[PDB]
Scaffold this active site. Structure first.
Site, mmCIF file in Angstrom:
data_model
loop_
_atom_site.group_PDB
_atom_site.id
_atom_site.type_symbol
_atom_site.label_atom_id
_atom_site.label_comp_id
_atom_site.label_asym_id
_atom_site.label_seq_id
_atom_site.Cartn_x
_atom_site.Cartn_y
_atom_site.Cartn_z
ATOM 1 N N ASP A 1 0.839 -1.198 0.000
ATOM 2 C CA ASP A 1 0.000 0.000 0.000
ATOM 3 C C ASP A 1 0.876 1.251 0.000
ATOM 4 O OD1 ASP A 1 -1.922 1.900 0.285
ATOM 5 O OD2 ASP A 1 -2.467 1.384 2.365
ATOM 6 N N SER B 1 -0.580 15.533 -12.061
ATOM 7 C CA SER B 1 -0.819 15.183 -13.449
ATOM 8 C C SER B 1 -1.056 16.451 -14.258
ATOM 9 C CB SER B 1 -2.053 14.283 -13.539
ATOM 10 O OG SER B 1 -2.416 14.027 -14.873
#
Length: 330
Positions: A35, A199
């Site tokens: 994770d 992004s």
């Protein structure tokens, strides 16, 4: 040193991936959910409340000759999905794919929430976010990667998750045969303890690319792709009959639909998520309403590039003094 381990989807939908981890001496192999959005290595154990164990493999520290109770240490975690767990702490030898750390903090669960009990395939979590998020008290502990870093050939790990198929986690090296083209690296902020990056935009299907900054985290422990409501609405508007359902808890779509791809930007590079990766199947057995793999992050407080996005790429988690992320197509 290096390590390399295969990671395997827990079910036919890629709801999560499990990787075998050796703990203790002799080894006890548990299948852990790696994770990158958390920083605790915790396991079902011989100390877990018996009614809360239902099929998981447990770690028994009393059977490990290298286990040592970390006196006074406790831990307690709550995840973004509302699940939680807590317990006490041992140190022990932990190996992943041939890479060994001695003295790793292994957090033994005394209590786990129902969603963990109900998932017999996940024996615990191995956190790969920054150690500043580790919950052990009164002495915070380091992640497996942080403990291994100085010994690794290069201070990196990579995630290469499969679509409906196994993939690979590598530690200490970048497998140049595992991706196409070049790896585009992008800046990371560690201010929240996550692999947080920005992004450069998105496209829906064959549509034009929209240049827009989208801050979010690269999180292997989250199944879906969670993005701003504007972006998500633009995606599902291209699927006839798709709608957000308050009763189901997100966007659903007719199972008869063909889904468009979704592209996200990494610098000037582009990662394409095929439409099939966005199909999470019927909302209940036999239903013709299917659950979407791109969902709104409104109310979660952060955008999350979960497995839906990451499995479309070869991803480098560069843990150099100034961390960075790398993405390549594959």
């Amino acid at each position: 040193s290096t390590g390399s381990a295969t990671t395997t989807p827990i079910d036919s939908l890629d709801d999560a991936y499990i990787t075998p981890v050796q703990i203790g001496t002799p080894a006890q192999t548990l299948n852990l959910d790696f994770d990158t959005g958390s920083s605790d290595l915790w396991v079902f154990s011989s100390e877990t409340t018996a009614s809360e164990v239902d099929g998981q493999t447990i770690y028994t520290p009393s059977k490990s000759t290298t286990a040592k109770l970390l006196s006074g240490a406790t831990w307690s975690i709550s995840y973004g999905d509302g699940s939680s767990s807590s317990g006490d702490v041992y140190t022990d030898t932990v190996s992943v794919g041939g890479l060994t750390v001695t003295g790793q903090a292994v957090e033994s669960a005394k209590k786990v929430s129902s969603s963990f009990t109900e998932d017999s395939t996940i024996d615990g979590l191995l956190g790969l976010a920054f150690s500043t998020l580790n919950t052990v008290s009164p002495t915070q502990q380091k992640t497996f990667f942080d403990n291994a870093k100085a010994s690794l050939d290069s201070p990196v790990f990579t995630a290469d998750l499969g679509y409906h198929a196994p993939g690979t986690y590598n530690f200490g090296f970048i497998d140049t045969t595992a991706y196409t083209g070049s790896i585009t690296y992008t800046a990371v902020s560690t201010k929240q303890g996550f692999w947080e990056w920005t992004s450069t935009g998105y496209a829906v299907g064959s549509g034009t690319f929209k240049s827009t900054s989208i801050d979010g985290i690269a999180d292997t422990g989250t199944t879906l792709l969670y993005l701003p409501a504007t972006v998500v609405s633009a995606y599902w508007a291209q699927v006839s009959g798709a709608k957000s359902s308050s009763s189901v808890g997100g966007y659903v779509f007719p199972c008869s639909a063909t889904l468009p791809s979704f592209t996200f930007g990494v610098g000037s590079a582009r990662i394409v998520i095929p439409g099939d990766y966005i199909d999470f199947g019927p909302i209940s057995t036999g239903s013709s309403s299917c659950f979407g793999g791109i969902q709104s992050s409104a109310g979660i407080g952060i955008n999350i590039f979960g497995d839906v996005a990451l499995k479309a790429a070869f991803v480098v988690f560069n843990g150099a003094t100034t961390p960075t992320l790398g993405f390549a197509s594959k």
